[PDB]
Amino acid sequence: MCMKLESDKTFPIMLNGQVNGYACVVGGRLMKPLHVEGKIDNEQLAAVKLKKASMYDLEYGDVPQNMKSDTLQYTSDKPPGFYNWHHGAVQYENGRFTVPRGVGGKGDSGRPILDNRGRVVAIVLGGANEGTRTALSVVTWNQKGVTIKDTPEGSEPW
Amino acid sequence: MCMKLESDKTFPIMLNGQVNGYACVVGGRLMKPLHVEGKIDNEQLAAVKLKKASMYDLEYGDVPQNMKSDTLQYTSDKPPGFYNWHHGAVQYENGRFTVPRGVGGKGDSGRPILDNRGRVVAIVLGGANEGTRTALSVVTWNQKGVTIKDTPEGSEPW
Amino acid sequence: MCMKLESDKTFPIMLNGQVNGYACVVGGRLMKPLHVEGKIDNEQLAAVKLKKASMYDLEYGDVPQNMKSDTLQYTSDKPPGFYNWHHGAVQYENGRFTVPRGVGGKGDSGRPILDNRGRVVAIVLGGANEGTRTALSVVTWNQKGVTIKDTPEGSEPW
Amino acid sequence: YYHRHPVYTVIVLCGVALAILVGTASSAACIAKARRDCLTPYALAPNATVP
């Protein structure tokens, strides 16, 4: 479901040893985490100039010609409920994103969170262990459509 | 037919994001157009030094080891019409290579026109839509066997 | 048995033209021949530093974090005869290595020899030439465990 | 001796400094070569026991 949609749109970054975090392309814009180091696998968009957004911990840039088949449209409309995910299922209860306990780990910190109809609503950066059903820090959009962060507690950024 | 015949011999030229032309292996010669800009694929046939022509709008070189597979005989023995092609069938009525409407776009400025016996006859370069049916500016071989250019009026490279 | 175990363990070296040698990961160390030139694949393992042992005609280095499942332990114990091999079967009669004539050749410098239990016993670097049973110049390990270089007369390194 | 003959003594002391520098460098080179060629038989074989 979500893996099929995220395939050939989500491009992993290797530190020249192994993968250390994916990079997303949303709205005709590449963006990767600040803390993720290394070059990306797809060489066409590996040479694009990337602007820092260190308040949001993301490098962002414009894709050259991949406007379709890498669109991956985002909407800020986030009704409460369940959302599909690369690993499992996530929920938006009480204005926050929580994953199950053991899922999530180092090198897996660029993964988008999609909707039921395949719209990204969230970009994962890190997370904290709030008992069972751990929450995770994430870059989202508010009601007006302005990018915000959600960094709960001492979320260790993987 | 010709689609399988010219396969693994018609090597495409990259525009660094897509394909903007084709390159041919004819008589040990790596023939690619000059107006087609970018980098040729592979590494066996990419690291060689090519020599410009600028009168025929081609560039040529040599292959180091691929002579066993660099098998595309050029032939000027050419009855007038009914020749195969990458996309369809080309006609040489009235001494001019002719194609139906529409077919032929960017990324298709370097592929050979084959014979009925798998022999390269023409290397397409551009075209013009006028007269009774559209015509092609193309590098071929004359009756004596010397390299010749045939170009319509207003024949911009498609 | 041998083909399955040597898969994803024998890492080809490319001189940017073709495979021209194999580099082997044994005992927690990478080793490759000196006389082979080019770039090892597996770019994770291509970035490690290799120090030269010119006595044994090798470059060896510490492997990356992949300790487990990539050991491929060596055996100093050498019962005579009937050892498996990548291109077939080798023999250990009279303290030497013999293969049927015609196997091996240029581009196959560095493949390992495995025992019946799959443990590596020898890493070749070249070969001599007897009329029927071709000999192999090889890096092995002595009965005390110290590494030794068994080279017959007229060993062509290829 | 420098007040007696300056050039002769400065070239003798330069020769002594050059001799001790070349001697130390060559001794270090042979020591490093010996260590290299005695540890490469045992660096390539981890399971072996160094005497």
UniProtKB/TrEMBL annotation, chain D:
Residue ranges of the TM segments: 7-32
Compartment annotation: Host cell membrane; Host cytoplasm; Host nucleus; Virion membrane
Subunit field text: The precursor of protein E3/E2 and E1 form a heterodimer shortly after synthesis.
Protein name, as recorded: Structural polyprotein
Source organism: Western equine encephalitis virus (WEEV)
Shown segment, full-protein numbering: 678 to 728 of 1236
